[PDB]
Design a protein around this ligand. Structure first.
Ligand SMILES: CC(C)C[C@H](N)C(=O)NS(=O)(=O)OC[C@H]1OC[C@@H](CCCn2cc(CNC(=O)c3ccccc3)nn2)[C@H](O)[C@@H]1O
Ligand SMILES: [Mg+2]
Ligand SMILES: [Zn+2]
Length: 806
């Protein structure tokens, strides 16, 4: 055993030791209890960043902890390979997205291996390979025939300069983010998953996820947005029926979740596309311009509430069916066509958005709810205005004195008896649009035949292979310009037909990959029945909070779809969920010659803050998440090259709890490396005193008080670390606990015969308690202390007798 700790001399040897023993290569072995620990697989972007290292170190800590406790642990890794980054690098570097992807995969796989993650690489998947996406094409065809996947026209944002479709996030002031050209709204046929058919299942099954953060489940409930409200029909006044057709000439239908406040409606609002808006705008040009501006908007869902609410009056009126009030119809920008009836009522006294809307236009506010003896001021909104449980009705005629649920049922009775309304349940959730006008994605297995219609590709002909010999040029997605791809024969009639050229939303690959890991080479289905029944569901899932809504919902949706097809037998894909925090770092910049800022990487800066190149000052700016935006990313490969994998892993687990943001710190890195030197020196100095002995065990009567105190600290540390790994999942406090054990060990004279035995017991436990976090150095130090295989010695047991004081 060498005196000094040298990671480059031990880390490759420890990795070869694990790989030779195949401790991470697992099968469906019924002799050991399974454990499925999964970290969200990465985009093969080029190289790992610090977020990857934190996520996969966390997953490796939990996996190795369960491994030491005797579980048959599967920790798989793969590549979410489809998407736009490969197309953009293709347009910048004149390479094929496939070639760019596969080279990134090879390099990033080397980095992951150098970090010592206990990963079953024999289960690796690449989602851009036909052997993977053939099965999501298969599920697509099966659901398309059942109507769960359907085709209908939708509206997209067309950029005519870049010749591409853009998301709402890519539109700024009505113009493309890169081209700067005005975007055009176009109706094109697209495919949709009928996810609203599973809305009630996806909402209620969240209650089963006892080991998910309540934050994530709340976000999913709000996204699904179930409401039990009332359909209310307002009869159109006789003086307001010009230009109206059908039922729109008879009544205005609306949906409200507050029918107990129907006596407090002071106006109604309709969407820009509503027929009442169209009829009233046929004359007035200001209404036409307001309708045009609403349609030209491209506001994303995450900013819908922040959008300034505006409206225009129409001069048309409707009648409240409960009190006969004649209310004016307004066109408003917050009423969205396709959501319910595309029309709402407004009770400014008990809905804060209606309050601010009415306060802006001086529209009437009428109180209909009272809570205690609270004072109502029509000029200032108070939180009790919207109270839905402790409120009682006022100014509502025959409904006065009722609470929410009683007034709800009475209003429903009044409306139904006169045919003016009925109860109704609504969901904010929209159907899942999966069509993408992009090349680097999974082809949609549909053939268009003018005789047979939109025909799904048969199962024998799957997959529809995406050609990899493609370099996108920019002037449109190349698939729609490659007759060698889309020209084909109809699988139903053999006649001339055309393949679909749109590709799938890349969220689809990530919606079922956790199942594919169970049998990644199975060629007769998405997942083999024998492996699905063994591994069941993912026991532990680790990823970033940015996937709390869409990805998780999609994955839960796919699981229930695959269960209904009979491929799996679990209702939920992920039992436990851990959301890791961001990795942030200081920023540095120099002022431009044009009044701007040039952002400088931290690796090119030395703190006396001075640029390393010319020794000239640099401005220290705010700390934020690492990104290429302000050029503040710290390359983990340089951290590995300079300190080793164990130092990188230890710093990430010690700097902050997994949920809390991790602040990059040079001294924090150095403190981690110096602790590994201390651990190395501790075992070296111990073995230099007389070599290893048998660790203390059994009756501790007769041990000195100092050695009894060390054993108490030892097994209290084991219980604390076990609770930190297994229950709390706070790895920073576990490292501190082992440090406190080593501190007391340093203060204890362990030179006697019984002292050596206790010292052996301390060090054998300490290297095993830290093995999940820093396995390279712990595997090396364990082999110097004991000749048994560390993974066969197992997780340290707590000696209860060591915790009983006299
Ligand atoms: C399941 C599917 C849907 C996952 C999907 N393929 C994915 O998110 N793949 S992914 O490759 O993007 O990420 C894979 C997993 O590990 C990383 C987590 C990142 C969380 C956000 N973050 C990032 C940072 C730090 N950035 C840097 O240092 C940096 C950045 C840019 C340039 C230079 C440096 N700090 N926080 C992800 O959420 C996920 O769990
Ligand atoms: Mg349960
Ligand atoms: Zn045909």
């Amino acid at each position: 055993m060498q005196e000094h700790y040298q990671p480059a001399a031990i880390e490759p040897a420890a990795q070869k030791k694990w790989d030779d023993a195949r401790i991470s290569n697992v099968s469906e072995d019924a002799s050991k209890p399974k454990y499925y620990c999964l970290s969200m697989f990465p985009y093969p972007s080029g190289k790992l960043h610090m977020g990857h290292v934190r996520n996969y170190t966390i997953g490796d800590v939990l996996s190795r902890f369960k491994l030491l406790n005797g579980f048959n642990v599967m920790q798989p890794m793969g590549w979410d390979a489809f998407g736009m980054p490969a197309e953009n690098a293709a347009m910048k570097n004149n390479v094929a997205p496939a070639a760019w992807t596969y080279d990134n995969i090879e390099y990033m796989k080397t980095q992951l291996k150098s970090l010592g993650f206990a990963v079953d690489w024999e289960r690796e998947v690449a989602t851009c390979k036909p052997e993977y996406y053939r099965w999501e094409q298969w599920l697509f065809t099966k659901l398309f025939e059942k109507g769960i996947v359907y085709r209908k026209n939708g509206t997209v944002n067309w950029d005519p300069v870049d010749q591409t479709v853009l998301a709402n996030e890519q539109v700024i002031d009505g113009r493309g983010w890169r081209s700067g050209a005005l975007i055009e709204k176009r109706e094109i046929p697209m495919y949709y998953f009928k996810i609203t058919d599973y809305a009630e299942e996806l909402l209620n099954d969240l209650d089963k996820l006892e080991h998910w953060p309540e934050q994530v489940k709340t976000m999913q409930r709000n996204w699904i947005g179930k409401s039990r409200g009332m359909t209310v029909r307002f009869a159109v006044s006789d003086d307001s029926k010009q230009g109206l057709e059908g039922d729109y000439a008879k009544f205005l239908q609306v949906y409200t979740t507050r029918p107990d406040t129907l006596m407090g409606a002071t106006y109604v609002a309709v969407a820009a596309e509503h027929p009442l808006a169209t009829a009233a705008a046929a004359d007035k040009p200001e209404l036409q311009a307001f309708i045009a501006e609403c349609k030209a908007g491209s506001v994303a869902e995450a900013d819908m509430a922040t959008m300034e609410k505006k409206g225009v009056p129409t001069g048309r009126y409707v009648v409240n069916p409960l009190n006969g009030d004649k209310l004016e119809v307004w066109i408003a920008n917050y009423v969205l066509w396709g959501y319910g009836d595309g029309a709402v009522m407004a009770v400014p006294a008990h809905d804060e958005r209606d309050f601010e809307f009415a306060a802006k236009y001086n529209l009437p506010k009428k109180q209909v709810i009272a809570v205690g003896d609270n004072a109502f001021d029509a000029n200032r909104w108070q939180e009790w205005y919207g109270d839905k449980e402790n409120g009682v009705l006022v100014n509502s005629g025959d409904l006065d004195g009722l609470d929410f649920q009683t007034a709800f049922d009475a209003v429903a009775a009044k409306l139904q008896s006169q045919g003016a309304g009925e109860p109704k349940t609504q969901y904010r959730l929209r159907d899942w649009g999966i069509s993408r006008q992009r090349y680097w994605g999974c082809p949609i297995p549909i053939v268009h035949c003018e005789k047979c219609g939109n025909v799904p590709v048969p199962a024998d002909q799957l997959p529809v292979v995406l050609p990899e010999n493609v370099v996108p040029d920019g002037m449109g997605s190349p698939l729609a310009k490659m007759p060698e791809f889309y020209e084909t024969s109809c699988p139903c009639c053999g006649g001339a037909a055309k393949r679909e050229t749109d590709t799938m939303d890349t969220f689809i690959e990530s919606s079922w990959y956790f199942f594919r890991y169970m049998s990644p080479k199975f060629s007769d289905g998405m997942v083999s029945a024998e492996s699905a029944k063994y591994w069941g569901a993912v026991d532990q899932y680790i990823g970033g909070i940015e996937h709390a809504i869409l990805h998780l919902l999609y994955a839960r949706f796919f699981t229930k779809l695959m269960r209904d097809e009979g491929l799996v037998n679990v209702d939920e894909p992920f039992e436990r969920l851990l959301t890791q925090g961001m990795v942030v770092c200081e920023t540095y910049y120099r002022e431009n010659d044009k009044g701007g800022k040039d952002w400088i990487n931290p690796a090119d800066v030395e703190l006396t803050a001075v640029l390393k190149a010319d020794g000239l000052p640099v401005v220290i700016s705010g700390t934020e998440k690492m990104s290429k935006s302000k050029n503040n990313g710290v390359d983990p490969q340089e951290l590995i090259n300079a300190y080793g994998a164990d130092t990188a892993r230890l710093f990430m687990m010690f700097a902050a709890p997994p949920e809390q943001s991790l602040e990059w710190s040079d001294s924090g890195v150095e403190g981690a490396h110096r602790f590994l030197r201390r651990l190395w020196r501790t075992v070296y100095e111990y073995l230099k005193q007389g070599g290893a002995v048998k660790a203390f065990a059994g009756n501790q009567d007769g041990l000195s008080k100092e050695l009894k105190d060390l054993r108490h600290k030892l097994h209290s540390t084991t219980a604390k670390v076990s609770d930190d790994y297994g229950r709390r999942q706070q790895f920073n406090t576990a490292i501190a606990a082992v440090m406190e054990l080593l501190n007391q060990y340093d203060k204890t004279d362990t030179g006697s015969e019984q002292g050596r035995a206790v010292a052996q017991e301390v060090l054998e436990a300490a290297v095993r308690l830290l093995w999940p976090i820093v396995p390279h150095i712990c595997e090396t130090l364990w082999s110097e202390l004991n000749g048994a295989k560390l993974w066969e010695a197992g997780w340290p047991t707590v000696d209860e007798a060591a915790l009983v004081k006299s």
